[PDB]
Amino acid sequence: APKAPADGLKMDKTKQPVVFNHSTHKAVKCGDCHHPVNGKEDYQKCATAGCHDNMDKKDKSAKGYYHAMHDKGTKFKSCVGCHLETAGADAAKKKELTGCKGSKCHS
Numbered sequence: 594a595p596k597a598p599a600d601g602l603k604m605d606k607t608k609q610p611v612v613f614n615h616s617t618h619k620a621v622k623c624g625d626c627h628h629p630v631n632g633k634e635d636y637q638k639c640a641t642a643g644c645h646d647n648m649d650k651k652d653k654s655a656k657g658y659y660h661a662m663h664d665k666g667t668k669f670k671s672c673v674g675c676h677l678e679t680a681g682a683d684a685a686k687k688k689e690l691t692g693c694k695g696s697k698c699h700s
């Protein structure tokens with residue numbers, strides 16, 4: 594079993610670093626974020642050294658940080674994709690979950 598790291602993970606793969614708090618995701622499906630890859634859910638940083646570390650902020654495939662992070666119809670529930678949905682028409686949750694310059698993901 595993977596040992597989730599302490600909350601406060603800082604995602605600085607890009608110019609806009611975001612802190613991920615597993616605590617706010619411990620109730621999520623560890624397989625929904627680290628979906629089953631290579632036959633096993635890669636329980637490692639989303640932008641692993643060759644996973645979502647694409648700084649093109651345009652790769653709309655399964656190998657671009659931005660995409661999986663701002664896209665919704667992704668192989669799995671993405672960051673903003675699970676956010677726009679975890680908000681349930683909640684301008685308050687939509688500004689915190691999907692809010693880019695005024696949410697929790699982009700303090």
Ligand code: HEC
Binds near residue numbers: 626662667
């Ligand atoms: C952090 C916990 C992660 C999140 C959030 C996501 N991933 Fe990944 N990821 C990887 C591959 C090879 C794919 C595609 C799998 C396939 O269909 O063969 C994906 C895909 C996504 C997507 C959607 C991509 C798309 O729609 O094109 C999202 C939104 C996504 N992942 C979120 C590989 C990896 C990986 C390799 C080591 C890791 C650690 C992660 N993904 C982590 C996350």
Ligand code: HEC
Binds near residue numbers: 604
């Ligand atoms: C990409 C791997 C992720 C990052 C970076 C963040 N999330 Fe999420 N997230 C989810 C829920 C259910 C919540 C709480 C909703 C609520 O109670 O209002 C959150 C919250 C956050 C926050 C702020 C929360 C806080 O400050 O306490 C940040 C900064 C954040 N998330 C970043 C759910 C999901 C989810 C569903 C599977 C996914 C894939 C992600 N979050 C991904 C990321």
Ligand code: HEC
Binds near residue numbers: 619638
């Ligand atoms: C999405 C809501 C997630 C769930 C559910 C889980 N993890 Fe996660 N994890 C997520 C992100 C955004 C990142 C990287 C953020 C960054 O700062 O780059 C990670 C990272 C990890 C790591 C660190 C990478 C490493 O050193 O291997 C570990 C250790 C990890 N995640 C473990 C883990 C476990 C055990 C989970 C289930 C309890 C789990 N994560 C769920 C996003 C999400």
Ligand code: HEC
Binds near residue numbers: 647649690692693694
């Ligand atoms: C939290 C679920 C997010 C929301 C809502 C938005 N973005 Fe985001 N963005 C998120 C993460 C985890 C990251 C990477 C953190 C890091 O710095 O490593 C980003 C990054 C960006 C970037 C950086 C692009 C790059 O330099 O490669 C941009 C340009 C960006 N985000 C834009 C953006 C927009 C337009 C959004 C509103 C829909 C938005 N983000 C929301 C997480 C989240």
